[PDB]
Amino acid sequence: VVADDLLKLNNNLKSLVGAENPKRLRPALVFLVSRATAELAGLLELTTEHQRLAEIIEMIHTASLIHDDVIDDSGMRRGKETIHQLYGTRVAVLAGDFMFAQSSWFLANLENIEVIKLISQVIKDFASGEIKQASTLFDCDITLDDYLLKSYYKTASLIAASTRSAAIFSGVSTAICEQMYEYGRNLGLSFQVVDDILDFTQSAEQLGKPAGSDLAKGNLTAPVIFALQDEPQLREIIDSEFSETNSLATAIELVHRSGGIKRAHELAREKGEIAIQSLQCLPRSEFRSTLENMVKYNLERI
Amino acid sequence: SVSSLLEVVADDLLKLNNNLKSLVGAENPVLVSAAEQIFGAGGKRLRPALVFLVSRATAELAGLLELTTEHQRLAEIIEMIHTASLIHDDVIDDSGMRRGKETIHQLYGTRVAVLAGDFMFAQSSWFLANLENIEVIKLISQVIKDFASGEIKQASTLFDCDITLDDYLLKSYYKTASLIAASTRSAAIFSGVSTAICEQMYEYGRNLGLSFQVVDDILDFTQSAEQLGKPAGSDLAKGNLTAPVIFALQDEPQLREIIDSEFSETNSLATAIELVHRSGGIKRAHELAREKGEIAIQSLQCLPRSEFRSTLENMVKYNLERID
Ligand SMILES: Nc1c([N+](=O)[O-])ccc(Oc2ccccc2)c1Cl
């Protein structure tokens, strides 16, 4: 429901301002970059465009997740009517469409064409990437650059668009807008790499079959990609889609003993450092400090 | 003949049809394949034709000597929005077929079909932003929201025999006429004619779009099952009650029982279709289509005489005479 979502954002926005006075992540980044750049621009309060932008970004994020979660009914010769009722497919599609459409309508009425271009491209690349996703599972030839680009299209691009668009609506210089873009992109990549690290390490310490982990479904991320550089048996096991009994557990221990987790953690740190450096075009402020702290807090999840 | 009606913009349509394939890109083979499946399936391209005709009529009125690239891109954008809508409508309907070919979701599953339509809506928006006209950007964004609003309303009222005619006309506007009305107003905007002419071009497209939808709904009954691809009454069968049924319900109350049962008793669908024909439903729906067509032709009188205007008038006539 767009109504409920717009409600929570405003509520979550309220406590944010009230805190800096003396999911939430994407609107919070919009708010913080909005306030930092609005002060730089001489604005006395956030504009309507800033406040709408935070709602727009979260509507797009939520619509994206709702659609990405729709079921694949492709091979079925009957029972499709039942499986869609069971899984609420029509509601999912309709809700996502209306959320997307509401966000596009908001965006048009903010009247900034640069922002519309930016955000429209984010959704293109997201939908395009998610269609391709199934074809990339278990492909051990994926490069680290391919994985970062994939993570950008899936996660970091919307975040980078949101922080750039916050600066655009403040009217700060193009150079600062580009720096806010770079902060969002590199925080988003650092965020995604840490999520991928955590999926792995949690999988290696859990009691049952890690059957729902990234590695188990063939979604090969930073720690595994690094490991594959030094682990010929890891490649062979992944290529087998863990056919042999208990081979998933073996693959997990090969990744764990490789240097891969440490190298992924350092990849997350370098992107985080680039993010923090992107903020130095801003003067000292509680908003800049908080944006710096989000990077640190992300890396502290280890 | 569609070719006879559309020859004054035949060159504009040929260029558009050449371009549609590349407008999705080439990096994503599955995406390319899905777009090809609908673009190459045989659509009439009424919407781009209306855009070219109004573009040329208004451009002439405004003193322009040639169609702008914005006019040309607009026609592609409108067909793309229409195509994204069809992809999602087929998912929402679980339609297995669309003009002879299997639907995108039949080939790749509902999730890929949804994401393909999403790509096409976002691509449409991105092309339109690059035309740099915020008035049109806002107008089209409203139309796309109208589509989503209409799909929700239609899914919420399936088999609902208490639907009013006014509700049916709003749903028809959301589903079909709103995009056409915005496309003809935007064609006028890119020619730089007056606000008043722009408003008239909106009203032309609105009423022709309503007239076209009412006729499509009539033809779902009166057309044969082969010449339709799908059997007659396919709208009624999924619970989408259109003008002929809304009218028929006023004279044949057993339709309510049949529809309320979602056609559970066997052969009840052909019983329902019989009742529609027995009523004055089809003729009352045709005269509704005619009323909107007359309003459409009236909205053209603010333009000078031109072959473009004459063809825009002829579109109204062809629709009412249509068997399709
Ligand atoms: N699915 C969809 C719909 N919709 O009405 O279904 C409307 C718009 C849309 O893309 C955009 C494009 C730009 C901003 C926000 C969303 C999508 Cl991807």
UniProtKB/Swiss-Prot annotation, chain A:
Amino acids binding isopentenyl diphosphate: 23, 26, 61, 78
Cofactor note: Binds 2 Mg(2+) ions per subunit.
One Gene Ontology biological process: isoprenoid biosynthetic process
Highest taxon, organism lineage: Eukaryota
Record's catalysed reaction(s): 7 isopentenyl diphosphate + (2E)-geranyl diphosphate = all-trans-nonaprenyl diphosphate + 7 diphosphate
Positions bound to Mg(2+) 1: 68, 72
GO molecular function: all-trans-nonaprenyl-diphosphate synthase (geranyl-diphosphate specific) activity; metal ion binding; prenyltransferase activity
EC number: 2.5.1.84
Cofactor dependence: Mg(2+)
Keywords: Chloroplast, Isoprene biosynthesis, Magnesium, Metal-binding, Plastid, Transferase, Transit peptide
Binding site for an all-trans-polyprenyl diphosphate: 77, 154-155, 192, 209
GO CC, any one term: chloroplast
Intracellular or extracellular location(s): Plastid, Chloroplast
Subunit annotation: Homodimer.
Entry protein name: Probable solanesyl-diphosphate synthase 3, chloroplastic
Organism whose genome encodes this protein: Oryza sativa subsp. japonica
Lineage summary: Eukaryota, Viridiplantae, Streptophyta, Embryophyta, Tracheophyta
Residues of the full protein shown: 98 to 413 of 414
From Swiss-Prot, chain B:
Localization terms from the record: Plastid, Chloroplast
Superkingdom in the source lineage: Eukaryota
Catalysed reactions, as listed in the record: 7 isopentenyl diphosphate + (2E)-geranyl diphosphate = all-trans-nonaprenyl diphosphate + 7 diphosphate
Cofactors that this protein relies on: Mg(2+)
Keywords on record: Chloroplast, Isoprene biosynthesis, Magnesium, Metal-binding, Plastid, Transferase, Transit peptide
The enzyme's E.C. designation: 2.5.1.84
One GO cellular component term noted in the UniProt record for this chain: chloroplast
Protein family according to the UniProt entry: Belongs to the FPP/GGPP synthase family.
Protein name: Probable solanesyl-diphosphate synthase 3, chloroplastic
Organism encoding this protein: Oryza sativa subsp. japonica
Residues of the full protein shown: 91 to 414 of 414
